[PDB]
């Protein structure tokens, strides 16, 4: 019978073994001290939805938005990637800043968009994040959805707000429709056309979304875009 009395504080945090973590802290483990991966205990707690451990570590003075890991992200970033709405809610209540950007240039709304976490996208919008917030790459949440979520949501949710459907990202000037064609995201293509996506608007290389469709020799895509003019 493993009783956790042998586990290190990182493994015990991951698994939410609350009393194990608390004994290691009072015995001298600094809640602010990172591990060999430059990850803090708050990060591990957040990405495993350990609500109570999060309260406890913060009460011991853990830094809420401390960057860590190879991707150089806050604990809130981690919870957002993983999809823990309750943890996103909890961390934002302690002052975590959802607009901070990680090492990939993304803030929280983009992380939630690109991993398909529809309820967190809704929540960030309900807390004041702009639906068309541009990340460091010039990507909107709708672009990230078109590119990465091959699914009705979160695209359908995003289109219920006053998005500027024909924006293009900063470096490629690809609209969300461009991204969906690029990615073969057939579910999203119909939603964007139905929401007014311009099939002729050209990116920075002067290719329209129809051009990209024709390029990929995808008969279904070419027909569907052509019939939306």
């Amino acid at each position: 019978i493993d009783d956790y009395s042998t586990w290190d504080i990182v493994k015990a945090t991951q698994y939410g073994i609350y009393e194990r973590c608390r004994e290691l802290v009072e015995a001298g483990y600094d809640v602010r001290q990172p591990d060999k991966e430059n990850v803090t205990l708050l990060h591990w707690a957040a990405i495993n939805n350990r609500i109570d451990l999060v309260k406890y570590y913060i009460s011991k003075g853990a830094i809420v938005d401390q960057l860590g890991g190879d991707l150089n992200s806050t604990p809130l970033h981690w919870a957002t990637r993983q999809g823990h709405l309750s943890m996103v809610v909890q961390l934002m209540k302690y002052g975590a800043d959802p607009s901070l950007i990680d090492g990939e240039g993304c803030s929280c709304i983009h992380l939630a968009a690109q991993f398909g976490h529809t309820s967190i996208v809704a929540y960030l919008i309900a807390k004041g994040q702009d639906v068309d917030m541009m990340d460091q790459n010039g990507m909107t949440p709708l672009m990230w959805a078109a590119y990465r979520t091959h699914s009705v949501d979160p695209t359908r949710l995003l289109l219920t707000f006053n998005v500027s459907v024909n924006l293009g990202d900063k470096y490629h000037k690809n609209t969300a429709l461009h991204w969906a064609v690029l990615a073969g995201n057939t579910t999203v293509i119909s939603l964007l056309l139905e929401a007014g996506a311009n099939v002729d608007a050209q990116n920075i290389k002067g290719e329209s979304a129809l051009d990209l469709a024709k390029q990929r020799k995808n008969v279904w895509m070419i027909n569907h875009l052509q019939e939306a003019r």
């Binding site: 493994k11 991951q14 991966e37 990405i47 190879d70 991707l71 981690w78 993983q82």
Partner: peptide, 10 residues
């Protein structure tokens, strides 16, 4: 399972 690996590049 629990998450015991840090987020990585795609």
């Amino acid at each position: 399972g629990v998450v015991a690996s840090q987020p990585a590049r795609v």
